């Protein structure tokens, strides 16, 4: 009858079901009452773990691990405000589609409302974030492992997207010797402990029917809009749009290639709005749409339909067009959706871009921000993998560069916070393994600030660039008053980044010319290791860049 | 008919509402969103505006500001993930007091759930932590700014603890100038923009009553146990146990002199034990008890009665003793229910408590984390104040110091989170001015460690002590397995904090000896401004001291 013996046996039914729906990395952070659940992963053989001391960057660092790696990630923390650490990713998970399988020790009932130390109301913490809460009760014998098993494979079974809190108590003692407490009610579960499949398969799938009259709309005048796909995706999107004859808009998070780039500036000339005007149908496919143009014109035109095709659940279109929205994996549905080569019906549309992409070349020199996110394909790693920070660098990019079609790109665009993403970086490279570019701005660096001790373990380089233009400029950009825009909305916080690096023993450059971040480039990929370079550029240099390049190509 | 300047109007009746219920401090977080509640903040000169880049750190440091200066302090915040970074520190004002207004700005109704970037579902998102939630509607000139004022005055008036969640949708545009658009809706408030007053007075007080049979209970042999309560309260519960000749378990959070000092190692000798078990009554003032063998021993204890006295809410004693939880300010409290002059009855204790202290300073000599948690009443800064992290520190100085009576301490000791103590500490700083020491391990240091950058500005010298015992060795003291003890506990980070106080142009000092600590003392208390002393100790010397003085006392 020994309480930690029994709090073990029920944590290993739990941690070795998750096993059985693909779970294989999971994200541990420090502490006693989750004893039961860390042991329990620490002994499974099944499972790459990992650790960290902030709870925040814990979520993170799993959301990018399931972000790249399409598997559900297991989380463990203690009870108390580790818990609501993890809300942020948690967030963001619910909106990009994540699989956080969040594991919350928690004390005993009869430890809640009573000035217990570190112990706080956990069900329902996270309100209608979680796409499934799993509230488990005290452990007891007198609940059969059946039932504990078959719990957590309703949750992951039916989990479409998103995440899953499965909180758990347990009772004190968490520490003594394993003794037999438990085994015969774990043996109740007969052959399955040797078994791949879970007690319960549960596993509809959510897929919306293929369109019969899609052969009628793709012959009328039709716009492809590709946001956030795979990789694979948004070079099967390409071709597609291509056969079509339809002009593509392809984002940043795209990977098309974007054949009609700079669309951010473009689309500010009454000459391709008008064009596009002609449009009796817009495809697109993905969402979180990145750039200000593209999203106004979705918002003035008014096709006959508009259609959203992506993974995601629920409207995706945040100017409520009439038309149709289309749950599928987007490569499967553009099976059931092919194209039949049709001569395009765009005549000024490619002029345009290619005229903005030359007028962004001619201004390609200067050693500032803009520039950097115009070239950025001159420095992606070869066999490697992109990640694209929020506020002004997405933007850049997505405004003055061409990124190649099938180069992989991620970001944590659903609520684009500046909260966690160098943490994510490290999920995202630990996932696949490749060398990976992130590009981040200062105050989201120093947001994330002590991520950089994850970074000190990357299985290939990962060159971090920081952009130091002194406080968050996006506000420079957007129409903020004069008077108060340094103090309530820049936040300049004069640092630089060397002694950030060097407390983490990682590698630094500070280029001061394209020749030097050349040789820092040539440098950082050499090693297994993160190579910290900051790009240190006039406050507000980039958001007029982009402002006067969106001008002239107005008035083309 | 502007909307922009609609919404500043709507967001100045709510910003200077709160000017009538004492809100001084408003904590300010960057964002667009947020624009109207920020811009009405800046330009209401009532208000001490603080700013940071990191929500979860601006929630404690609104969390440090309240909890010195006792009166509600608020906080803005843009939508999205901003949001849920304030959830540490809601949660913690929950359990010990502090009101936190929290003015989250949202994106309006018609862009919730339609894959709008950086926007969430934000109404109820912090479910049953807030004291108060209030979900504000879609600002509008035909709901009445009486209605508007109204609300906020019955949250704030009927505020006694905790937290508020103002939710606060805005529609675009955001920016522009300000026209007459909603004057005369503002002007329907007449002359109330001149008072001093909220519009609706709400202010019902809750409290205990006198209890009737008080001249019977103190006349019995009695217990004091003193937990957090203000310096005051401190010296006060000192005085009135003392003349009812009852032994008083002071807790480090008490500032009562601790007359009966070590408890956590006293109260392991069964002498002392079998001398409780004579107590007919245990009259607690304030909660968040420290010591393990305090708490053991008030789970172990059967008074006839056991009553709790604080200004928290809801039940405070984690062992459910028969007995009374009474509301009250400790001190109006201590004049309702007044001392008797009465005989001592312990005997056996004070021998106790004289011999455990003998056997800590015997071992004072050694230049170790245990060493220094004994001696830290010996370097407190005149007229200051002393912030205690979480972990072993707090632990360490309440068993082996010996802290004065009326010597503010600070803490955060709710939910007890090595989340936000740097953050908190520089609140603390900022609402007192005084002269601060703030002593945090090292993960702690890590975890809030961009809050250095808010430890750039203090009105006096703060001292933040880092022990660097290299991992969580609180986990050391803990019977944790050997085997998984360092990779999933202790958690190791290896580094130094020299190059994060250069980072923020810090001075920093790592002595060597206690000549070397007490040089870097005198030097920092002579400027405004934080200096960093990082005390590098064997990672288990502490844990073990703590250890083997238990059971040192315990054989007495
Ligand atoms: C956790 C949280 N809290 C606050 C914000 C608000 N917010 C932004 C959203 O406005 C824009 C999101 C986006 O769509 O990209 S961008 C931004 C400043 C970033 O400064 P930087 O890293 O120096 O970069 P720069 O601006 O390029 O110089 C902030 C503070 C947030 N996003 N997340
Ligand atoms: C946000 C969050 N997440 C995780 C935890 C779990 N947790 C603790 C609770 O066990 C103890 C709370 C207490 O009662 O004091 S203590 C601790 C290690 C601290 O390491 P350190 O700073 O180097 O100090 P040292 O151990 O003295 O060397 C952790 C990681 C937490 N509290 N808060
Ligand atoms: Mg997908
Ligand atoms: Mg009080
Ligand atoms: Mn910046
Ligand atoms: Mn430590």
Redesign the interface.
């Given at each position: 009858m020994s309480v930690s013996a029994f709090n073990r046996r029920w944590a290993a039914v739990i941690l070795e079901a998750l096993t059985r729906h693909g779970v294989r990395h999971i994200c541990?952070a420090?502490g006693?009452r989750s004893?039961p659940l860390?042991?329990a992963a620490?002994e499974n053989s099944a499972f790459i773990?990992h650790?960290?001391?902030?709870?925040?960057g814990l979520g993170h660092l799993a959301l990018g691990l399931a972000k790249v790696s399409k598997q559900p990630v297991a989380v463990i923390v203690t009870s108390?405000?580790?818990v609501?650490?993890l809300?942020?990713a948690l967030?963001?998970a619910?909106?990009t589609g994540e699989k956080l399988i969040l594991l919350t020790a928690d004390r005993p009932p009869?430890?809640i409302?009573?000035?217990?130390?570190?112990?706080?109301?956990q069900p329902?913490?996270?309100?209608?974030?979680p796409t499934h809460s799993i509230s488990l009760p005290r452990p007891t014998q007198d609940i059969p492992a059946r039932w504990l098993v078959s719990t957590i494979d309703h949750a992951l079974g039916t989990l479409h997207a998103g995440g899953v809190h499965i909180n758990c108590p347990f009772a004190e003692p968490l520490?003594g010797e394993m003794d037999d407490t438990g085994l015969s009610w774990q043996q109740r579960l007969g052959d399955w402990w040797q078994d791949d499949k879970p007690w319960l398969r549960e596993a509809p799938r959510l897929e919306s029917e293929k369109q019969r009259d899609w052969f009628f709309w793709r012959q009328k005048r039709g716009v492809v809009v590709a946001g956030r796909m795979s990789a694979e995706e948004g070079k099967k999107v390409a071709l597609w749009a291509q056969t079509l004859g339809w002009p593509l808009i392809g984002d940043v998070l795209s990977q098309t290639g974007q054949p009609l780039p700079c669309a951010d500036l473009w689309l500010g000339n009454a000459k391709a709005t008008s064009e596009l005007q002609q449009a009796q149908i817009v495809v697109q496919l993905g969402?979180?749409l990145t750039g200000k143009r593209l999203l106004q014109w979705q918002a003035s035109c008014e096709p006959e339909e508009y259609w959203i095709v992506d993974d995601?659940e629920?409207?995706?279109?945040?100017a409520?067009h009439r038309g149709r929205r289309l749950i599928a994996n987007i490569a499967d549905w553009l099976e059931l959706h092919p194209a039949e080569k049709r001569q395009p019906w765009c005549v000024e549309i490619p002029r345009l871009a290619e005229q903005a992409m030359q007028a962004v070349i001619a201004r390609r020199d200067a050693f500032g921000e803009a520039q950097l996110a115009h070239r950025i394909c001159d420095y992606l790693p070869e066999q490697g993998q992109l990640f694209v920070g929020n506020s002004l660098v997405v933007r850049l990019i997505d405004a003055l560069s061409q990124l190649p079609a099938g180069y992989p790109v991620y970001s944590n665009?659903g609520?684009?916070?500046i909260?966690?993403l160098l943490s994510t970086a490290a999920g995202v490279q630990r996932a696949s393994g490749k060398p990976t570019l992130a590009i981040v701005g200062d105050?989201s660096a120093?947001?994330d600030?002590?991520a950089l001790?994850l970074l000190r373990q990357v299985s290939a380089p990962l060159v971090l660039i920081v952009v130091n233009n002194n406080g968050?400029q996006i506000?420079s950009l957007?129409?903020?008053?004069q008077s108060?825009r340094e103090?309530?909305?820049?936040?300049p916080?004069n640092?630089?980044?060397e002694?950030?690096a060097?407390?983490?023993e990682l590698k630094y450059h500070r280029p001061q010319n394209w020749q030097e971040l050349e040789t820092a480039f040539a440098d950082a990929w050499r090693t297994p290791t993160t190579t910290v370079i900051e790009m240190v550029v006039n406050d507000t240099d980039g958001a007029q860049t982009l402002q006067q390049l969106l001008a002239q190509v107005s008035h083309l």
């Open positions: 541990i420090p006693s004893t860390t042991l620490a773990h650790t960290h001391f902030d709870e925040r108390g405000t580790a609501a650490n809300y942020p967030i963001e619910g909106l009869e430890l409302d009573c000035g217990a130390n570190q112990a706080i109301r329902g913490m996270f309100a209608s974030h520490y969402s979180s995601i629920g409207r995706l279109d945040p409520h665009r609520a684009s916070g909260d966690g105050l120093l947001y600030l002590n001790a968050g506000f957007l129409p903020t008053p108060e103090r309530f909305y820049l936040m916080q640092v630089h980044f002694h950030a060097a407390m983490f």
